[PDB]
Amino acid sequence: VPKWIQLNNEIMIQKDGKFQFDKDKEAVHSYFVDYINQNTVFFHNLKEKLDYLVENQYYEEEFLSLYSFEDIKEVFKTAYAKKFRFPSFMSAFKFYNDYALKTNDKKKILERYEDRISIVALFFANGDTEKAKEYVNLMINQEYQPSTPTFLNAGRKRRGELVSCFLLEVNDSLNDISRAIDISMQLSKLGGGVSLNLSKLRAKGEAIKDVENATKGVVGVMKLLDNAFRYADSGAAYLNIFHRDINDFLDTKKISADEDVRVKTLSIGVVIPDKFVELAREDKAAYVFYPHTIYKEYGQHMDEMDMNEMYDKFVDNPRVKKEKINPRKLLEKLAMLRSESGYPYIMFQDNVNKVHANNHISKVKFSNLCSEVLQASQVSSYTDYDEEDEIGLDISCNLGSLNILNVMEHKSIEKTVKLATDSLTHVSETTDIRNAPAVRRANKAMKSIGLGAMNLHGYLAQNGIAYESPEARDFANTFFMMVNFYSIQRSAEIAKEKGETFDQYEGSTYATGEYFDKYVSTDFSPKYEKIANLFEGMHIPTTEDWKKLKAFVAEHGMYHSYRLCIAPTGSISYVQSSTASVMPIMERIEERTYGNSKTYYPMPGLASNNWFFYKEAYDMDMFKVVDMIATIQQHIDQGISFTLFLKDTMTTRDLNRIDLYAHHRGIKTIYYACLSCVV
Amino acid sequence: VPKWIQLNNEIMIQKDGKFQFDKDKEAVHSYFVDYINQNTVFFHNLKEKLDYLVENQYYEEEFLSLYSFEDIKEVFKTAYAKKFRFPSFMSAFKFYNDYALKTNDKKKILERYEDRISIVALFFANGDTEKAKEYVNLMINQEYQPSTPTFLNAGRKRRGELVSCFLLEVNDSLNDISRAIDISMQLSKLGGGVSLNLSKLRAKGEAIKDVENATKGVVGVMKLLDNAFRYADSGAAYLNIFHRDINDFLDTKKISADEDVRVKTLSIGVVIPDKFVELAREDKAAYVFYPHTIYKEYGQHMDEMDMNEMYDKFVDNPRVKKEKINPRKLLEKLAMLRSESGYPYIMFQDNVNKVHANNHISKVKFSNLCSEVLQASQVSSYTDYDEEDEIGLDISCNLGSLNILNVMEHKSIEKTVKLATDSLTHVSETTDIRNAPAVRRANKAMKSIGLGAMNLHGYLAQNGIAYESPEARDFANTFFMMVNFYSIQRSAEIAKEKGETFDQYEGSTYATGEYFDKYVSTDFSPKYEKIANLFEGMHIPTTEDWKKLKAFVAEHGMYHSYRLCIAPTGSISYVQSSTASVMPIMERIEERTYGNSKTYYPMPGLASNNWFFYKEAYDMDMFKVVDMIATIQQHIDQGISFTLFLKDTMTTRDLNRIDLYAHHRGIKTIYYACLSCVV
Ligand SMILES: Nc1ncnc2c1ncn2[C@@H]1O[C@H](COP(=O)(O)OP(=O)(O)OP(=O)(O)O)[C@@H](O)[C@H]1O
Ligand SMILES: Nc1ncnc2c1ncn2[C@@H]1O[C@H](COP(=O)(O)OP(=O)(O)OP(=O)(O)O)[C@@H](O)[C@H]1O
Ligand SMILES: Cc1cn([C@H]2C[C@H](O)[C@@H](COP(=O)(O)OP(=O)(O)OP(=O)(O)O)O2)c(=O)[nH]c1=O
Ligand SMILES: Cc1cn([C@H]2C[C@H](O)[C@@H](COP(=O)(O)OP(=O)(O)OP(=O)(O)O)O2)c(=O)[nH]c1=O
Ligand SMILES: Nc1ncnc2c1ncn2[C@@H]1O[C@H](COP(=O)(O)OP(=O)(O)O)[C@@H](O)[C@H]1O
Ligand SMILES: Nc1ncnc2c1ncn2[C@@H]1O[C@H](COP(=O)(O)OP(=O)(O)O)[C@@H](O)[C@H]1O
Ligand SMILES: [Mg+2]
Ligand SMILES: [Mg+2]
């Protein structure tokens, strides 16, 4: 057993009752000197390194050719000037095991952490050598972490797509079903996570032409999709809760499900308008609808109509066919299934669209794997082979997360937010997906990005603030207000600089101005003095600054239809020495076995004198956590991946009381505690 | 229990030891007077009938509008002038239960047998009122029976496609696989039987781009197709025996197969070049090949190269990857699987192409469900969404069968063959399949039809000739030579009349003349005197008549790339009072239960003084049956659906000796004893 693993395990051998937290500094030092340095290829110079990496098909050539090699050396030297040292064993282990470029034979290390960062920065900057330096500092200071698809792939040949998260609409025809199968496979082949909205497909037992009772329904298309994802080397189906197939749709995922209906590689999500929550509260028998009878009567997809306005009219219309269900029992079934599998991802549709800026394009109808992407979409119609198709708007989103601790300590909320936006904008403009025409069309038209945040709990716990406290909410309220301020400002700056807005921007609430109403009348500076001290050195936007930004946007518009969403953070959380996303930590010390050895990872910053503040999520009040997320969500235009942390000693009514409380507080999406759609 | 069922069962109550065969004449009379006539809607006139059937969306309007109603009445009266009476209970039962148009509520009969025939004839004739009369007589005399898809659908609204048999090529890309899934569903939705050639897909464990060992292989695409056919309301996959996946391909159909690999709605067929049969005979270890390594080396699909020429070169080429197998044991496995399921349909590829007329277009590479369609094909390439596709040639075939007994008694071999061709040509020209571009392109370019024959055994047994006798072969030799003569002659007549040939006709052996070599040097008039007497009244083509037809074709060409194939005959065999296809009868008397009653159907014409000639197939020598089929096959340009009739007391070596003997005798396809691809 290696020496770094020896010192690593010595954390768990207590001294004066205290753990040996300092042993992990030795462990990662031993891990480098006695291993990493000896398997890292070292060239006589950097040009020799880059020429080798280019000539051996490791790196791409075009993006490097935009720089004079004297500039590439300055950028690399900027990365190494930091003298970055991983503070823990698992942080360095995860980077070299998951991210560092290895040789084709997987024997030696080609990239140090400074190398991957320099290459990504050279890619983002697109020739601007000083900007490349800015990106290097931003990443080497660990202020910003682009998503794994971007951070891992930028600058490679054989490089996968930098975006790997996609959402698809599916129209109610065999032609469209066939095209969705192929698109799913085309994206999944590229490593993408694909979520499809099935709410427009007619329900089981609806007519085809004049043959009554002919349709397989949603479960039939799920079976085809399940197989498509199996063949092409993870997908999701969403369904509106008022769709007649909702029960059958859910039952495909019961762990006891019969194999005739079983679907094994599809996640599921459920879309819940306010009207359903009211019916459930009142314990009144509800109706679910056969969507094609609604289409034949109203000429519109049920999915494109306002169920809060239309429910009673659908019920009274004799040409609309429906079924009676028990809304409380359906709500209970959603709790049971999430205890089994985490998902169904639950989306409170009216909590999304109440504050949605682009309802003029469409209401938000569904979300992605792990349910943080919330954007408008419009269904295509792929017609017969000899006819032109009608290309709509699907969704793809490009992700990154700033690191709250390092942003606060560097007092760089503005600079990080604006710079990270520039990078996500570059990934959006260099993406051209083939074989997904509505994804490609939407990416150019909508120009949407998704900037998030990680290390919320870690930063709070290291500054003496409990995750569940009202002080924690007071910090989050202010911090994310500021993130949103500078995000909107940078999007308008890019719109002025380029002279473009996203397509149909002038119909958005950004252009008509009501987006800014709460920001010009309400102040979001800290109510607690000790929280205000954390922001010392950074100007906090006032209602007056918001009035001037409102006016600025009104003159120049905005480049991005969407800017912010908070995805989960996977392995990269280790590399960042950061608690995952904005969630509370799960364990104070993680024990995982790797290759016949047990490794220990205490939470980033865990000491004996802050033990109390690293409170484990399962011991927290989920109602207080809901309050925290609802506070962050005020200033995020898309969504927040939100996993409830529950003990098995929870009755099904306790579970639904959380659901109802989350809906009450304005939460957009929720599930219980996705690789392509995480940072 | 009804009276017709009473008299029907009285056949089986013997008199002087003899069955009561005459009781079935009473049964079908009782079946009409006491039931059929009372549930048949009778209008005051025919215009009242047709107007009702048009106005109630039963019939189509366009084809009837091509006639003046005085002419429609003459055509209908021509049908009724025959005073056609069904000679047996089951013949009338099958027509009214399976073919006669009933009301939307399925309560009363709208069509008598004379009505369906008149409508089909009016459809075929396309305005020519005298031709409509010719079609009426041809069908009411039961000289010709168009296939069930055509006979059932012609003249309807809500009418399904008149062709329902299709064959598809699939290219080696994800794009092509996705298009084949959709095409399969588009055709299957229309009621089609779809067979796909999977021999071009790269084998399991081949590279994708530069990722080695990445491919699922043929079984992966079979699983997708299996699901496609399940969703869209029967298909087939063919594979060349030299494909590396052949064993895995076969194992998907073992009745004991694990569900991870199980395929439940796909038939399978295997394509066997001569080189494999030689390797099996010699008991020499054979090789199967990874087709993509062959493609990367030779630039051609293994499926498009001559394995008899290339086998040793493939084996010696170090850049071609292969696997060793046991050819004898593989041949044995094909016998086992056919005992289980009937198929794998076995195709002896060189027995097809040795006598194939259009090798210049392509070799024949695969066949259909029940394996009688044998035509050239060329693979498409469906490229990325933004790029033009390359449309190749798939296959569809339009079927019918003449009734040998009635053709011989009416001495109408010429008139039936030429008239049936005209009808199959009309079905071909009125077919426009959407969403299958290579099927549509091939149908116009190739103009192929498939005329067959039924009632061979019945006709032989009723003229004192045993199915296994050399006299039976002597009759078949002459009869089908004549069918082929007048078929070729009518195809050339249509080519002169229209001034067109099928595309690239001048590369065929019809144009270069070697097709006719055996017909200008060998006489095919009967060797047996009693067989020659059967043809009295009809001129038998001589070598001189063939020389003049050869010259005729050389001047005018031919309209049809393919003309003849002998499909199985399903329920319509009853309606025709005909033994199935050209096969020997299976049972002298069929006992089947329908609705709590047992029905009896003795073979068409079975009497006590011809009992010996209705010898049951399972008591026959399959080697003599192979001889019979090989004799018919000389004069059929496509294939013959050929089911072996075997007792379970057959060793696996006995089974392979039949296979080897069938190959020896030139048989093209074979399996053991399809609805969309039967007449
Ligand atoms: N394999 C490598 N070998 C050498 N330098 C590398 C390598 N990988 C990255 N670098 C980085 O490239 C930069 C320049 O490296 P190089 O050794 O060519 O220059 P130097 O000797 O440090 O400086 P100067 O140009 O003044 O000689 C340094 O920041 C170094 O850390
Ligand atoms: N339901 C039906 N009622 C009447 N005739 C029918 C019907 N179905 C088919 N036919 C056929 O239509 C043809 C003409 O029928 P119709 O009764 O109108 O004429 P008709 O009285 O026999 O002759 P004519 O025109 O000299 O009066 C006949 O051959 C008849 O068998
Ligand atoms: C994408 C994909 C293809 N395949 C199959 C389908 C095809 O038979 C083959 C890949 O064909 P293609 O889709 O044509 O792949 P490619 O063009 O990117 O790469 P290459 O140049 O090597 O053709 O492998 C899989 O087995 N799994 C997959 O996920
Ligand atoms: C063809 C087919 C469709 N479907 C589904 C797919 C679609 O959701 C719907 C049929 O859509 P379509 O493919 O659009 O059918 P259509 O246009 O011929 O008929 P209609 O005018 O009624 O749309 O039913 C099946 O369930 N099984 C099938 O076999
Ligand atoms: N925690 C660490 N993170 C990153 N690199 C490390 C770490 N520990 C050691 N190394 C690498 O090992 C080299 C030798 O280690 P050492 O001599 O202890 O440090 P230094 O270079 O500061 O004197 C360092 O220059 C560095 O490249
Ligand atoms: N075997 C049969 N096939 C067809 N139709 C039949 C048959 N037997 C009876 N029918 C129908 O029943 C009608 C009345 O039968 P019947 O009086 O016995 O015959 P016919 O009309 O020759 O005198 C016939 O006109 C005919 O339409
Ligand atoms: Mg439709
Ligand atoms: Mg390819």
Residue numbers in the entry:
A (entry chain A), B (entry chain A): 6 to 238, 246 to 685, 695 to 700
The authors write:
Ribonucleotide reductases (RNRs) catalyze the conversion of ribonucleotides to deoxyribonucleotides, a conserved reaction that is fundamental to DNA-based life. Nearly all aerobic organisms use class I RNRs, which consist of two subunits: α, which contains the catalytic site, and β, which houses a subclass-dependent metal center. Contrary to all other class Ib RNRs studied to-date, the sole RNR of Bacillus subtilis displays class Ia-like activity regulation. We find that B. subtilis RNR has arrived at a remarkably similar solution to the ATP-cone through the evolution of two unique allosteric sites that modulate catalytic activity by inducing contrasting quaternary interactions that either enable or prevent the full range of motions needed for RNR activity.
With insight from SAXS (see the section “Methods”), a 2.50 Å resolution crystal structure of the S-dimer was obtained by co-crystallizing holo-NrdE with 5 mM Mg2+-ATP, 0.5 mM TTP, and 1 mM GDP. Electron density at the S-site could be unambiguously modeled as TTP coordinating a Mg2+ ion. Electron density at the I-site showed strong evidence for an ADP ligand displacing dAMP. As ADP was not present in the crystallization condition, we suspect that it is a hydrolysis product of ATP (see the section “Methods”). Interestingly, we also observed nearby electron density for an ATP ligand with the adenine ring positioned against the F47-loop. Regardless, an important consequence of either ATP or GDP bound to the F47-loop is that the F47 side-chain flips inward by ~90° to form a π-stacking interaction with the purine ring. With F47 in this conformation, it is unable to participate in the formation of an I-dimer interface. Unexpectedly, we were able to trap the final six residues of the NrdE C-terminus in the catalytic site of our 2.50 Å structure due to partial disulfide formation between the tail cysteines (C695, C698) and two catalytic-site cysteines (C382, C170). However, they allowed us to capture the flexible C-terminus, which has never before been visualized in any class I RNR.
